[PDB]
Structure formats: structure tokens, C-alpha cells
Amino acid sequence: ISELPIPALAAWPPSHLRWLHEPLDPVQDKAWVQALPKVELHCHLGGFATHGELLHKVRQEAANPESLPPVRAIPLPPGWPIPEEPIGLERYMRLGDNNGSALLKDPGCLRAQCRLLYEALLADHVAYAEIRCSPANYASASRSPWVVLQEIRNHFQQAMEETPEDRRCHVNLLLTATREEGGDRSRIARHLALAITAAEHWKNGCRVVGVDLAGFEDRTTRAAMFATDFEPVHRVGLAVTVHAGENDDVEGIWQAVFKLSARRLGHALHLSRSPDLLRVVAERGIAVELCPYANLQIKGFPLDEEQEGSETYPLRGYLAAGVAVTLNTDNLGISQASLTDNLLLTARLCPGITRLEVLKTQVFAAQAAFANQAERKALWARLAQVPVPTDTEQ
Amino acid sequence: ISELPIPALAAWPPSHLRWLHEPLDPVQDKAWVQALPKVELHCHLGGFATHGELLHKVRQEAANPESLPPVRAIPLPPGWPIPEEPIGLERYMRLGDNNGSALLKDPGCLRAQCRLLYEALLADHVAYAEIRCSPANYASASRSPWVVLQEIRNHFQQAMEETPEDRRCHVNLLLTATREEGGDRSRIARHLALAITAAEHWKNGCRVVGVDLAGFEDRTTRAAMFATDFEPVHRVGLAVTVHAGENDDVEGIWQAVFKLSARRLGHALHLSRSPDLLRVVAERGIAVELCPYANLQIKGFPLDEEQEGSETYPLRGYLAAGVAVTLNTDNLGISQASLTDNLLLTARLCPGITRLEVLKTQVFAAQAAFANQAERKALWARLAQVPVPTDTE
Numbered sequence: 006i007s008e009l010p011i012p013a014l015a016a017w018p019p020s021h022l023r024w025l026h027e028p029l030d031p032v033q034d035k036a037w038v039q040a041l042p043k044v045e046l047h048c049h050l051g052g053f054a055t056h057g058e059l060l061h062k063v064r065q066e067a068a069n070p071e072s073l074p075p076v077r078a079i080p081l082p083p084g085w086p087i088p089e090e091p092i093g094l095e096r097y098m099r100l101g102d103n104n105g106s107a108l109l110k111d112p113g114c115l116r117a118q119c120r121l122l123y124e125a126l127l128a129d130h131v132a133y134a135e136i137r138c139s140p141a142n143y144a145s146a147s148r149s150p151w152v153v154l155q156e157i158r159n160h161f162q163q164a165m166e167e168t169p170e171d172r173r174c175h176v177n178l179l180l181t182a183t184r185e186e187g188g189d190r191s192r193i194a195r196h197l198a199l200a201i202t203a204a205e206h207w208k209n210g211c212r213v214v215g216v217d218l219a220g221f222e223d224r225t226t227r228a229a230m231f232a233t234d235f236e237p238v239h240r241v242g243l244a245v246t247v248h249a250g251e252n253d254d255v256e257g258i259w260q261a262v263f264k265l266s267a268r269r270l271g272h273a274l275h276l277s278r279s280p281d282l283l284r285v286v287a288e289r290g291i292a293v294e295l296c297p298y299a300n301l302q303i304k305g306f307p308l309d310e311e312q313e314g315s316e317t318y319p320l321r322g323y324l325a326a327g328v329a330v331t332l333n334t335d336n337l338g339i340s341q342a343s344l345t346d347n348l349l350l351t352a353r354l355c356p357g358i359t360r361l362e363v364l365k366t367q368v369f370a371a372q373a374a375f376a377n378q379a380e381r382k383a384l385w386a387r388l389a390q391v392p393v394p395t396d397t398e399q
Numbered sequence: 400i401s402e403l404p405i406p407a408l409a410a411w412p413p414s415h416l417r418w419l420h421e422p423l424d425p426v427q428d429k430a431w432v433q434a435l436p437k438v439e440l441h442c443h444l445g446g447f448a449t450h451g452e453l454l455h456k457v458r459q460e461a462a463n464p465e466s467l468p469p470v471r472a473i474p475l476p477p478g479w480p481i482p483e484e485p486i487g488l489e490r491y492m493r494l495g496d497n498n499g500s501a502l503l504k505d506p507g508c509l510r511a512q513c514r515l516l517y518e519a520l521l522a523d524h525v526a527y528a529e530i531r532c533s534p535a536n537y538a539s540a541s542r543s544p545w546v547v548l549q550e551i552r553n554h555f556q557q558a559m560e561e562t563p564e565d566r567r568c569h570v571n572l573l574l575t576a577t578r579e580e581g582g583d584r585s586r587i588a589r590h591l592a593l594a595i596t597a598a599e600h601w602k603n604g605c606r607v608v609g610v611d612l613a614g615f616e617d618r619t620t621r622a623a624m625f626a627t628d629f630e631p632v633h634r635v636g637l638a639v640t641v642h643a644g645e646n647d648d649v650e651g652i653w654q655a656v657f658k659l660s661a662r663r664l665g666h667a668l669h670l671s672r673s674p675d676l677l678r679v680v681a682e683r684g685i686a687v688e689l690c691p692y693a694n695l696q697i698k699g700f701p702l703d704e705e706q707e708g709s710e711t712y713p714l715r716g717y718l719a720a721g722v723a724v725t726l727n728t729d730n731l732g733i734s735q736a737s738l739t740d741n742l743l744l745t746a747r748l749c750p751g752i753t754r755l756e757v758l759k760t761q762v763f764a765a766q767a768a769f770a771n772q773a774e775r776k777a778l779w780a781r782l783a784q785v786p787v788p789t790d791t792e
């Protein structure tokens with residue numbers, strides 16, 4: 006009874022505890038996961054409303070209809086959101102080209118983008134969310150990166166107050182310090198200085214809690230970030246996550262843990278290959294952020310297999326090894342899947358994934374979130390309200 | 400009830416749950432604290448038997464009795480274990496000199512030091528212990544520091560194997576860079592190469608799990624530590640622990656976390672006066688090792704107060720701030736107190752400390768231990784068996 010992730014599970018009757026240990030059903034437990042309080046740690050602001058009906062809602066409320074770009078032709082791959090074959094990362098970023106840099110530069114569009122995304126987290130029962138944005142991408146000749154960040158913060162801080170404290174999601178912001186291919190270390194300096202300033206401007210409500218080192222790949226300009234000077238970042242309270250995408254080495258991961266002092270790892274799908282790194286990543290507490298849909302589409306994994314094969318999703322292996330694994334959505338729009346579909350696609354990606362392990366990935370995320378003491382106790386008190394099962398008759 | 404540390408406490412009757420939240424009593428709770436499955440993270444091998452009956456049980460086992468040095472007369476202060484005035488740190492170390500490097504160069508005395516200490520951990524109901532030692536301090540012209548360490552390891556492993564699994568204390572070894580370091584980078588290089596080699600020799604039973612950078616408290620050896628590459632230590636899997644304490648050098652602790660990648664801080668008593676550093680130490684999980692008796696005897700703290708002041712023992716503040724705080728013995732011999740007596744003294748150091756806060760320091764210690772997945776899965780299964788209270792009210 007001392008292996009349950011939350012203390013409230015121990016106070017259940019044996020009928021339900023026996024139910025927690027059976028495999029998750031991706032066709033019947035759709036309603037139990039939905040009511041579950043989730044925790045999002047990898048969500049990109051500029052990828053929420055990329056195509057469909059939400060893209061029109063964002064483009065409709067623009068403050069400069071004349072400035073809005075035309076909606077270019079972005080055809081989704083067939084079988085979407087489960088493509089016939091993977092599409093890659095470069096070809097995956099382009100599906101969200103109807104929204105982002107060239108759309109959200111409109112102050113009006115940014116309001117709907119930040120307010121429609123909060124309504125998508127609330128609908129999903131998210132209790133905590135770290136949103137990732139690049140304010141320097143949405144700036145113009147009259148709106149500096151600090152002005153855009155001011156707006157983004159208060160757009161989420163406004164939605165957070167118009168919501169009852171019982172169902173209120175808590176949104177925090179991560180500044181994606183992108184390793185620009187075309188931009189130089191000037192871009193990094195501005196990004197790291199913007200987070201250090203924001204990391205002390207706000208102490209309550211929406212806060213800038215860390216920096217996301219996207220572009221950690223490209224081990225040719227190695228690294229323009231391992232020069233670092235990240236010590237100011239560490240002394241102001243900020244936390245570092247490395248967006249280890251599009252790469253299959255282990256040396257970068259080693260240097261992110263011990264030179265960058267990173268606390269989370271993004272899309273670290275090849276950790277089991279090196280068991281020495283896997284043991285360190287599990288004893289130091291480093292958290293691994295996995296995105297089921299975004300990974301099945303960029304990389305592609307076997308679906309509905311009946312055995313843990315060689316090329317299977319590493320979620321179950323990570324859990325066995327002790328790694329603190331979390332499940333996220335990456336791009337809500339670009340992947341067309343909410344935080345519930347991703348936790349339900351796990352049943353088909355990892356054969357045998359128990360529905361108790363789902364609660365473990367949520368308890369892990371609750372410990373890997375860059376929240377403060379007040380924010381944690383409010384998050385812990387909301388995951389303690391785990392809903393009771395739906396179908397236990399067999 | 401989400402605040403309960405141990406999932407097993409959720410299954411207690413509502414009558415007892417209120418008992419936990421009541422303040423601890425350093426007298427009537429002895430039987431309950433004495434039976435708690437405890438975790439030891441700061442215990443020195445060379446400070447176990449410095450005086451008394453134990454000091455002679457060790458000397459009476461040396462293979463070369465004639466080689467034993469004469470038993471000096473070390474006068475313990477009056478009041479001891481609880482002095483009416485602190486004796487400083489340098490006096491504290493000299494207080495134990497009938498044991499340690501001078502005595503434990505004999506294979507017979509060393510064998511009786513690693514087995515009498517294991518009997519003190521069992522008598523105290525310890526389920527996990529990390530013991531720190533300096534093999535190079537006990538080496539002779541014919542006994543290499545690796546020969547000493549290989550003997551120390553097998554004395555504990557042979558003691559652990561002879562005890563039933565359900566009552567067995569798991570002992571792990573930390574290699575300590577002695578406080579007299581920095582002089583030569585040759586000795587800190589032989590020290591880190593011994594741990595990298597030991598961290599691969601043994602993968603089961605008693606293991607070398609980390610290195611303890613003592614002397615960090617000094618400035619001429621803290622730069623030698625910052626000039627030495629610790630990267631090979633991190634790749635092997637060894638963890639790093641640093642001694643804080645008398646030196647209230649905030650800059651030292653900052654660099655020990657982000658340069659040496661330290662996971663634990665020893666005697667970090669001045670963290671509250673640095674609110675910025677107390678947030679990083681409380682959000683990253685860095686654990687703080689506190690020694691209630693070794694801290695009352697080296698620094699001195701108010702006892703039996705009624706309400707918090709401005710200089711009381713910071714264990715209450717640390718816990719509120721979210722810091723992961725552990726309680727240990729430091730030197731079990733030099734201080735006449737076991738792990739049970741250090742937990743009970745917190746009731747006098749910290750006014751109003753709750754019986755649930757005591758059980759938290761043992762869950763914090765369990766998460767701070769440098770044990771692996773197998774060791775951890777067996778330590779949780781022993782902390783979950785928390786004894787039920789005696790009176791209940």
C-alpha cells in the first residue's frame with residue numbers, strides 16, 4: 006500500500022485498487038482520463054490554433070485585419086492525426102505556418118491565442134501548465150519583446166482570475182531561447198536577459214519560471230550555448246530545460262545535466278541505449294518529457310503490438326528504470342490532439358501500460374514542474390481529488 | 400490528508416492521525432522514536448568509539464597489541480553530551496583521539512570498528528546508512544588505501560549478510576576528502592581515483608556511492624576543488640556531498656550546487672538569511688544534513704525555549720520553506736548520542752516540533768540517500784512499517 010503515487014489512493018476499497026493495476030483501455034476509459042486533473046509541461050503557444058476552426062476564431066479577432074496574411078495551403082498528411090508514415094521534424098513545423106510568427110504579431114490575434122488556449126486547458130481539466138513562447142518572435146518596430154511578454158503574461162493572468170479557484174488552472178511561462186539558425190549569439194543574449202528581468206518582475210500569479218533551450222541540436226555550431234554564462238539564470242531562480250529534438254547522441258545530454266544544470270529533458274527517446282546515462286538521469290531526478298502524438302508523427306512507432314519489442318515506445322522502459330517520465334502534447338494544434346488523447350494513445354503505444362502508471366506520470370509531472378512552494382501545495386491538493394473509476398464490472 | 404509523507408499513514412485510524420500532529424515529547428516518545436526505521440546519511444567511521452567501554456573493546460582486538468599507541472587522557476567537557484557552552488569546532492575534533500587514523504591502522508582494530516558500528520546501527524533500528532571514511536588515512540607502508548577500503552567494504556558486507564533480510568541495515572560508503580586537504584592536488588587526485596575505481600568494482604551489497612568533499616569550509620582547498628575536473632566522477636555515477644557549516648560563505652554553497660553539482664549540504668545552518676539561496680536549495684531538492692547534538696556542541700543553540708526566536712535551530716524554518724532536511728549523528732562516538740537521541744533533542748532545540756515533522760525527516764532522508772533502484776525499493780518497504788503509537792492519547 007506504500008507504492009501508490011498519491012496518499013489518497015490508499016484510502017480506496019480493494020475493488021478499485023485492484024482496478025488501478027489493470028491495463029488502460031483506450032476505448033472505455035475515455036471518460037475517466039478526461040475527468041482526471043492533468044499537468045502540462047510541454048505546450049507551445051505558437052502551435053495551438055494552426056489550422057481549422059480555431060484558426061479562424063484567432064484570425065477573426067485581429068486588430069489589424071489589413072495586416073493579416075493570406076491563409077496559404079497547408080495540407081495535412083493522410084490518416085491524420087495518425088499518419089500512414091512519419092513526416093519528420095522540419096516537415097512537422099510547417100503544418101503550423103498559418104499561425105505563429107507572422108500571425109501573432111497582431112496584438113488582437115495574441116489576445117485570442119492566449120485566451121483560446123486557456124479555454125482548451127480548462128476544458129481538459131489541467132491543474133497546472135507551463136506554456137512556452139518566444140516574445141522576440143512576436144515583436145515589431147513598435148512592440149519590443151518585453152512589451153509582448155507583458156501582454157502574454159497579463160492575458161493568462163486575466164483568464165486565471167475570471168475562473169473559480171476550484172477549477173482554476175495555473176499557467177506559467179517558459180521563454181524558449183532558440184538556437185537560431187540565422188541568428189547569432191546576439192539572439193541568445195537578448196533571450197536570457199529577458200527571462201532574468203521577467204523572473205523578478207512578477208512574484209504572484211502568472212510567472213516566468215524557466216528558459217527552454219530549443220535548438221539544442223546542430224552539433225556543428227557547438228554550441229553557442231555551452232559557452233553558457235547561464236550562472237545569472239541559475240542565481241535568479243530560473244530553471245533550464247533542454248529541447249533535445251532531432252538528434253540521437255548522448256554527449257549533449259550529459260553536458261546539459263552537468264554544465265547547463267538542466268532539470269528537464271525534452272523528447273529523450275534514446276536514453277535506454279546508454280544505461281550509464283539512464284542510471285544518472287534516474288538518480289538525480291531529471292524529468293523526461295514525452296509527447297506521444299508528436300512522436301508517433303515525427304518519428305513513428307509501432308501501434309497495437311502485443312509485446313515490448315526492440316523498437317517500442319520507451320515509456321514503459323523509462324518507468325521500470327525509475328526515470329521520472331511525463332506525458333505532454335507539444336503542439337495542441339499542429340498535432341490535433343489534447344492532453345487526454347496523448348495519455349490515451351499510450352495504451353496503443355506501450356503494450357500493457359497500466360492505468361496506475363498514468364497517475365504516476367501525473368505525479369512525476371507535479372514534481373518536475375517549476376512551481377514554488379505555494380504553487381505546489383495548490384497543485385498537490387488538486388491531484389488528490391482523483392476521480393473514481395467508470396466501468397468496473399468486467 | 401495529502402500532506403501525509405508515507406502512503407501507509409493514510410490507513411491509520413483518525414484517532415492516531417491527530418496524535419502525529421501533536422508536538423513531540425522528548426521523554427514519553429522515546430519508545431516510539433527508538434523503534435522507528437531510521438536512515439543515516441552523515442556518520443563518520445573514525446568517530447564511533449573514541450572513549451568508554453567501546454574504545455577498549457576495539458583496542459582489545461588489535462592484531463599487534465604492542466603497536467597500539469598509549470591511551471591519552473581526553474577530558475570531556477562538563478555537561479556533556481549537553482555542554483553549557485560550546486567548545487568550538489577544533490576542540491570538537493581533538494575530543495576524539497583515542498581512535499581514528501592512529502588506532503585503525505591495525506587490521507584488528509579496523510575489523511572491530513566496522514562490526515561494532517554495525518551493531519550500533521542495528522540496535523538503533525536503522526534501515527539504511529551511508530558511512531563516510533578515509534581509506535588513505537588508515538593506510539600503512541604495506542597496506543594500500545585500496546587495501547584498507549577493500550577491507551572496510553567487506554567488513555560491512557559480511558555483517559549485512561549475516562543478518563535477516565527483514566532486519567538488515569544496508570550500509571554504503573562515502574569517501575571523504577579530509578578537512579586537511581588542498582595542500583596538494585596529488586592527494587585529491589588519489590582520492591577521486593579511488594572512488595572512481597571503487598564505484599565500478601562493486602555493483603551489489605555494500606557499495607561506494609559518492610565522495611564527501613570536506614574542507615570546502617576552507618578557502619585554500621575550495622579553489623583546489625574548483626580547479627579539479629569532477630566530470631569523471633559524475634560519469635561513473637558517484638554523487639557529491641559538501642560540508643557547509645561554520646563558514647557562512649553563501650558564494651561557496653552557490654558554486655557547490657552549480658559547479659560541483661552537489662546533491663547534499665552538510666551543516667548548512669545559515670541558509671535562511673539568504674532567501675534567494677533558500678529557494679534554489681528548496682526547488683532543486685538539494686538535501687541538508689543536520690546534526691542536532693554535533694551542532695549544539697560546536698555552535699551551541701538555545702534549549703527548551705517556549706517560542707521561536709531569531710537564533711533558534713533552523714530545522715523548523717527549513718521545513719516550512721520546503722527544504723529537504725535530514726537529521727543525523729555526525730560523530731556517534733565523539734557525541735554521546737545515537738540517531739534516536741538526535742531526533743528527541745529537536746523537541747528542545749525547536750519548540751513545538753510535531754511528531755509528523757520527525758517522520759518527514761526520514762522520508763526526506765530516504766529520497767536523499769545515494770542508493771540505487773534496488774536499494775531504494777527495499778528502503779521504502781521498511782519506512783512504510785512505521786510503529787503504531789503506544790498511548791494513542
Ligand SMILES: Nc1ncnc2c1ncn2[C@@H]1O[C@H](COP(=O)(O)OP(=O)(O)OP(=O)(O)O)[C@@H](O)[C@H]1O
Nearest residue numbers: 049050051052105106138139142181183219220250
Ligand atoms: N520541435 C521543435 N524543435 C526545435 N525547435 C522547436 C520545436 N518546436 C518549437 N521550437 C522552437 O520554438 C520557437 C517558438 O515556436 P512557437 O511554437 O512558440 O511558435 P512561433 O515562434 O510563432 O513559430 P514559427 O517560428 O515556426 O513560425 C521556434 O522558433 C523554434 O525555434
Ligand SMILES: Nc1ncnc2c1ncn2[C@@H]1O[C@H](COP(=O)(O)OP(=O)(O)OP(=O)(O)O)[C@@H](O)[C@H]1O
Nearest residue numbers: 443444445446498499500501536577578579613642
Ligand atoms: N565538523 C566537521 N567539519 C569539517 N570536517 C570534519 C568535521 N568532522 C569531521 N571532519 C573531517 O572528517 C574526516 C574524517 O573524520 P573521522 O571522524 O572519520 O575520523 P578520522 O579522520 O579517521 O580521525 P583522526 O582525526 O583521529 O585521524 C576528518 O579528516 C575531519 O577532517
Ligand SMILES: [Zn+2]
Nearest residue numbers: 047049248335
Ligand atoms: Zn517542443
Ligand SMILES: [Zn+2]
Nearest residue numbers: 441443729730
Ligand atoms: Zn561530519
